[PDB]
Amino acid sequence: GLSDGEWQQVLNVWGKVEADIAGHGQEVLIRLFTGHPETLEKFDEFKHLKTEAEMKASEDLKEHGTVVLTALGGILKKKGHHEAELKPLAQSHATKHKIPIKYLEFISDAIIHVLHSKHPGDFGADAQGAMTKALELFRNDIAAKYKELGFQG
């Protein structure tokens, strides 16, 4: 878990994302898809957008980016008390979408990358630590539901 000062760091960082969630959203997805091309194949609407330029030119991709970060903001504000919100997600990602936990690791690393890239010199060492921890927690709670379901990857 995180200390209250660590949660207060995470929610301070999140305020910066909220200035523009769609712009952050699209950047996260592009880092994901360009860094790990295998992840794109999981998206039936977007698997034709293989390069960063093609990705950028899709408003459908940006709206998907919005849905994702808005789900995650919602969860971060629960300061770890998120069992009712995480259950559906883990269930749909394991059984409908068939998303290995390794992809969740990719996307968590993509968020850190994007925060340093969009806010150079404004994303402190302390801030990085707290955000990393929150994302670990999120991934670990999902990993527990995946094991329940025997979702092997």
Q: Which is nearer to ligand HEM, 57 or 71 (CB)?
A: 71
Amino acid at 29: L
Would you say 99 or 127 has its CB closer to ligand HEM? 99
Shortest distance, position 89 Cβ to ligand HEM, whole Å: 6
Q: Which residues bind ligand HEM (CB under 6 A)?
A: 39, 42-44, 67-68, 71-72, 89, 92-93, 97, 99, 103-104, 107
To ligand HEM, the closest distance from the beta carbon of 110 in angstroms equals 9
Answer yes or no: is 93 a known binding residue: yes
**Closer of 62 and 93 to ligand HEM (Cβ):** 93
Question: Is 24 a known ligand-binding residue?
Answer: no
Q: Can you say how many angstroms the Cα of residue 111 is from the centroid of all Cα atoms in its chain?
A: 6
Cβ closest to ligand HEM, residue 5 vs residue 152: 152
Smallest gap from Cβ 78 to ligand HEM, in A, equals: 13
Residues near 100 by beta carbon (within 8 Å), at least 6 away in sequence: 153
Nearest distance in Å: CB 121, ligand HEM: 25
Measure the CA angle with vertex 29, ends 76 and 17; round to 5°: 40
Residues making up the annotated binding site for O2 are 64
